[model samples]
Target: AECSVDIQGNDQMQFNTNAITVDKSCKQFTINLSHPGNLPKNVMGHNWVLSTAADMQGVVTDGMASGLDKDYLKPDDSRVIAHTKLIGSGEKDSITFDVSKLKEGEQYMFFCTFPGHSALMKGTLTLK
Candidate 1:
């Protein structure tokens, strides 16, 4: 079976869950992110992005430059281990990736790369 996680984003610039875990036996892992707030995507869009703790800021910086047309992410960015499409309130997006991309002892983080939201909308993930 696959390991999976569900998270929510809101107008307040926050994610519902602070952290996540992927079982070592899983072949693939998935993330589902949704905005339950009333705000629209133009003003408060959200997307789930994953990367090593070290490469997170740089990825977010490049994502800002990419703009919303690119889902607020750098297109084909190698640093982006996995990501979900940008969505507005009442919308949701999900993505799955091979478990091999994650390392057992590494510090991984999941966040919304929507411009300034990266600072407040972030959390940790790890393989158990």
Candidate 2:
């Protein structure tokens, strides 16, 4: 099995997949994120950000406060486990993190830090 996967986001505010899993044996995992729609980031920028399921809201809320210049994310926020650069249409970004970050009982999710994209642009991330 591979240690990485691809996820696509469209202008309609949707991710092609709602869930992602990391093979238990892998030491590191990566996600390739891209936008296919023709829209621009200023109108709808997208980025993949990781955090615990419990920390999702805080990450999003603080990201909103940070504004677009910071990819709608707080400056080097400790709450974020890993993330990719903000991308627009026809753009792509990648993020890789240690598999050990996924604790046995904790829940995690992959999300977009764009201002209003989190509500719809999120999915479950788990280690199997």
Candidate 3:
């Protein structure tokens, strides 16, 4: 099975999927993020940020303070397990991390750190 996923975001504040399952055998995993809507980053940027479900809010809060230049994510934030750069229309970004960091029973979350975007652009990630 593939060890990576492709997630797409559009100007309408929507993500292509609401759930992502990771196969247990993979030692590493990657996320390929792309923006399909025709909008500028300052107006409608999107990024992929992953963390424990419990850490989602904290990550988003600090990310709001960090702004777009930081891809809407806090610098060196321990809560963030993985992430991709903020992208605008037709742009793309990719990220890879060790699969060992994910525990079998933990609920992980993936979302866009763009201010107010996570309300519609968020999803769950599970390891199986």
Candidate 4:
């Protein structure tokens, strides 16, 4: 069976969950991110960024410097495995990445790069 996951972010800098699992048999993986709030993107923007757990901090730091036009992520950052576009209130974005990039024993992290959002919007991604 194919693997898919749904995630939600709100105006409060929060995500619906803190962990997700990817089925190894799936050739592709999908993540759907939604913002269920009443604020604009500038006030409560969010995006889903995926990278190794160890690389999460660095990615977030550099991403902050990259600014919102870049979706709070450094352009073409190799460390980033996948990500969705920034979403505002009631907006949603989704992305599908090749599962071949993931391995069973590696650790991955997903987070929002909207400045301080990472403090509450971060989560783990595990390959099973």
TM-score of each: 0.96, 0.96, 0.97, 0.96
Those runs of model 1 whose alpha carbons end farther than 4 Å from true positions after fitting are: none
Tell me the lDDT of model 3 at 14: 97
Query: lDDT winner among the candidates?
Result: 3
Q: Write the per-residue lDDT of candidate 1 for residues 55-128, one digit (tens) a residue.
A: 99989999999998998888889999998899999998888899999989899988888989999999999998
Query: Deviation in angstroms for 100 in model 3?
Result: 0.9
The predicted structure with the larger lDDT, 2 or 3, is 3
lDDT of 3: 0.93
Winning model by TM-score: 3
Question: CA lDDT of 122 in candidate 1?
Answer: 94
Tens digit per residue, CA lDDT, model 3, 1-128: 78999999999999999999999998999999999999999999999999999999999999988987888888889999988889999999988999999999899999998999988999999999
Instruction: Record all residue pairs in model 1 with backbone atoms less than 3 Å apart, i.e. clashing.
Output: none
lDDT measured at residue 59 in model 4 versus the true structure, 0 to 100 = 93
Which segments of candidate 2 are over 4 A away from where they belong? none
Q: Give the alpha-carbon lDDT of every model.
A: 0.91, 0.90, 0.93, 0.90
- Evaluate candidate 1 by giving its C-alpha RMSD to the native, one decimal: 1.1
What is the per-residue lDDT of model 2 for residues 14-128, given as tens digits with 9 covering 90 to 100? 9899988888889999889999999998888999899999899999999989988888998878989888989999999888889888776578988988988999999998888
Worst 10 residues of 3 by lDDT: 67-76
